[PDB]
Amino acid sequence: SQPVSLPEELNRVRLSRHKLERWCHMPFFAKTVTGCFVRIGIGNPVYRVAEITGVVETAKVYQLGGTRTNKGLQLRHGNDQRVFRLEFVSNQEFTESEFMKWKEAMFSAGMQLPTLDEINKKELSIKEA
Amino acid sequence: PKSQPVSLPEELNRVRLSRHKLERWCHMPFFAKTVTGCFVRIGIGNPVYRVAEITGVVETAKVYQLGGTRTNKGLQLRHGNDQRVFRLEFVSNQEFTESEFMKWKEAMFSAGMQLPTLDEINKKELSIKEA
16 A cells, blocks of 8 residues: 555556557557556656556557557646657656656645555566566 | 727737647647637747747748657747747747736837737637637
8 A cells, every 4th residue: 555655666667668669569558558657758858757547549650669650648747648659758767856756746636646556466467478 | 898909918818829739739630720810928048938929830840849749840920020930849838927918019019010809819719619
């Protein structure tokens, strides 16, 4: 029941752009990525912590590394909910500053933080054997 | 009354488009028809902003990130007699300040331009309503 307190903890359910590229044509892509988090580039360079709350189709097909996709992630950062192309997800870990700004957004939004149980159950559910 | 020219920033803010709204709309049909005649709070450098009317939408040479998407579009923007093209990434999400609004009126009057009426504002606002 302990709320997430450390970047290391939330990193257990962080998806890189690499993983997202590898998975983006898989049949259960939405089920897999929903409830995970990303380090998302939001433009100039600023990155944020965001939860994936769903997958949508984008207006345009675009290049993602070695493939092409029209998938977009529905991303939540506190009250902020927007669709982002997969191309803007970072391969790097959350910085401590990014993680702390996110916790502030959560509390200021009156949104309950994920628990370590919720994080561990999600991490386990999508392990690839 | 609706025949009066605009005189308050609250009135002009009825047709102000946020950067987030521009991002949401930028790849939908009739984007230029929708946004033309709206206003933006445009960032012009150091941070300073201007009130500007959108007079059209153009292609630019720079493909850039606009939130969750990519675009090369530019806004043709007018502030009194000053007309320029700006990337949409420079539009502010914040409301016009009273000083920005007053500076814009000063530019309009200097130029000999007349301000929109409340009727014109209301008609534009009603035409951009999301349902």
